[PDB]
Amino acid sequence: MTKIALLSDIHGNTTALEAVLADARQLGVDEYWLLGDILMPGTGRRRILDLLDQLPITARVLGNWEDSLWHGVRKELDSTRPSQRYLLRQCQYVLEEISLEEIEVLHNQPLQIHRQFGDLTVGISHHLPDKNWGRELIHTGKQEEFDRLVTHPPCDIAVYGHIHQQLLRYGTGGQLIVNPGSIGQPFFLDAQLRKDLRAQYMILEFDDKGLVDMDFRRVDYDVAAELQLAKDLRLPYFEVYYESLVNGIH
Amino acid sequence: MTKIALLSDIHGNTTALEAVLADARQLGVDEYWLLGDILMPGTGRRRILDLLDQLPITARVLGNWEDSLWHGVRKELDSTRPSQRYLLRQCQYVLEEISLEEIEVLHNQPLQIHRQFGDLTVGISHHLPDKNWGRELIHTGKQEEFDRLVTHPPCDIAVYGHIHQQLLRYGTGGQLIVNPGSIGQPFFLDAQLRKDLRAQYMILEFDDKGLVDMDFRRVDYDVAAELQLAKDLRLPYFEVYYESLVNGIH
Numbered sequence A, B: 001m002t003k004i005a006l007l008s009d010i011h012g013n014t015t016a017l018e019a020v021l022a023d024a025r026q027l028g029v030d031e032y033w034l035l036g037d038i039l040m041p042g043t044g045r046r047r048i049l050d051l052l053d054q055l056p057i058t059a060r061v062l063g064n065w066e067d068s069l070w071h072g073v074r075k076e077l078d079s080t081r082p083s084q085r086y087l088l089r090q091c092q093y094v095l096e097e098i099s100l101e102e103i104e105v106l107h108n109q110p111l112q113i114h115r116q117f118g119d120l121t122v123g124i125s126h127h128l129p130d131k132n133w134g135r136e137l138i139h140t141g142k143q144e145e146f147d148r149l150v151t152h153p154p155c156d157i158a159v160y161g162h163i164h165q166q167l168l169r170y171g172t173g174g175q176l177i178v179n180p181g182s183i184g185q186p187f188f189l190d191a192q193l194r195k196d197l198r199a200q201y202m203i204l205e206f207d208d209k210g211l212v213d214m215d216f217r218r219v220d221y222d223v224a225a226e227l228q229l230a231k232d233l234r235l236p237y238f239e240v241y242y243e244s245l246v247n248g249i250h
Ligand SMILES: Nc1ncnc2c1ncn2[C@@H]1O[C@H](COP(=O)(O)O)[C@@H](O)[C@H]1O
Pocket: A009, A037, A064, A065, A133, A138, A139, A140, A162, A163, A164, A185, A187, A250
C-alpha cells in the first residue's frame, strides 16, 4: 500500500499548512504531491519552504503563482494595474526572506508529469497540462476542457488544483479527475458551505488491486493565530487576507 | 460528530454488502443512509433484508429497482421486451424468500428526503428528486439536470446513487453533489479502473463546524464465494451476474 497526500494551493498560509502536515503525519502518509501555488498572499516564507524540505515529495508541478512571483522579482509588473500592484507588494513581502536562487527553484518545475501505480497511470498538473492559469476547469467547465487532463497524453486518473475546490469527476471515457481543494484559501460559491473554511486536502491510497481510497479531508487550524501572524509580520493587504480566511470571499 | 455510511445499489450482492458492513462497523459509523436498488439481480434476499434490519438506518429512499420488483410481482411488466422477461425472472426468484407484504414496504419509500446538520441541508434521492430512473445524471449529464438535485427545493449538499460511480461535483451555485457509487455492481467506463471491481461506498462525517470528511471507499470481498453462492441458489442468468462481478460489463 502507498498512501499519498495531495497538497495544493497553500498560498503562504503557514498555520493551515502546519495543521495539514500534522494531520497527514498522523495518518501515516508515505508520500506527498505538491500541485503548486505555494507562496502568497499569505504569511509564510522561509517557514513554508522548510516544512516542505522535511517532506518526501515525489511529484511536483508549477502553479501560476510561482510564475507570478517570478515575474514580480524580475520587475515586470506595472502598479498602474490594480492586480499587478497587489502582486508586486506580495512579491516585495516575499523578497524580505526568500532569495532569487530559491525563487528560481520554485519556478523551475514541470507543468505536467505522470506517475504509475501497477495498472494505473496518473496525470498531475496545476490546471491544464500546458496552461497553469485560467478558468477552463472551474466547477461548470466544458467536458472538452476536462478531457484534456486525461487524453493526449492519456492517463487513468488525473489530479489537478487551481480552482480551490474538492472534486471527483470523469473524463468522457470514464477516467477519474480529482482535486484536493486548497490548503490556504478554500473556495466556496455556496454561502452555507462557506461558513466552514478549514483547510482542504486529499489522500489517495493505492494497493495491489488499484485505487482503494479517495479521502477528501478538512483540517482545523487556528485562524486567529494566522491573522495575528499577518499583523506581526506586516503582511500587505491585511483586510483582503482577513476576508478570505474568515469570510471566504476573494 | 456523526459518521454516516451511504449504502447504494446493493443489487442483491450478498457478499459485497457483508464486506461493506464489516468495514463500516470497524470505522465506528453512527448511521446508514440507504439510497435504493437493494435487491436484484444478485443472490441475497432474506439475508439482505436481515442485514439491513440490524443497522441504524436513519434515511431511506426509493430506487427504480424497487419499483421494478413491485411491478414484477404484480405482473405489470412488459413481456414483449427481452430486458423485462429477464426482470420478471429476477422478481420470481426474489418472491421465493420475500413476501408481497415486504415488497410493499420496499415500494413505500419516499423519492427524496432532507436532513439538517447544523447550518447544512442535505438532499437525498436515488436519482432525480422526482424521477428515480433514466440517464439524466450520468457522468456527462447536463448541468441543468444536476442543478435539480440542489434547487426546487434547495439544499447545500445532495447525495444520490443510480449511476454506480463515485462522484464529488457541484451545482451551479456551488452546492455539493456526491455519489457513493455501487456496493454490488460498480460501474467503470475506463478499462484500467474496470480491473478493480471492489465494492464502492462513501462516508460522510459532520461535526460542530460542518462537513469535515468525504471518504470514497473501496471494499474487497470474496467474489468466488458470491459466484459459488449464485450457483448454489440457482440464481437466474448466472453468466450475466458473473460478467458484472468479474469483468464489470453490464
Ligand atoms: N467557479 C469560479 N468562479 C469564480 N472564481 C473562481 C471559480 N473557481 C475558482 N475561482 C477563483 O480562482 C482562485 C484560484 O486561482 P489562483 O489565482 O490560481 O489561486 C480561487 O481562490 C477563486 O477565488
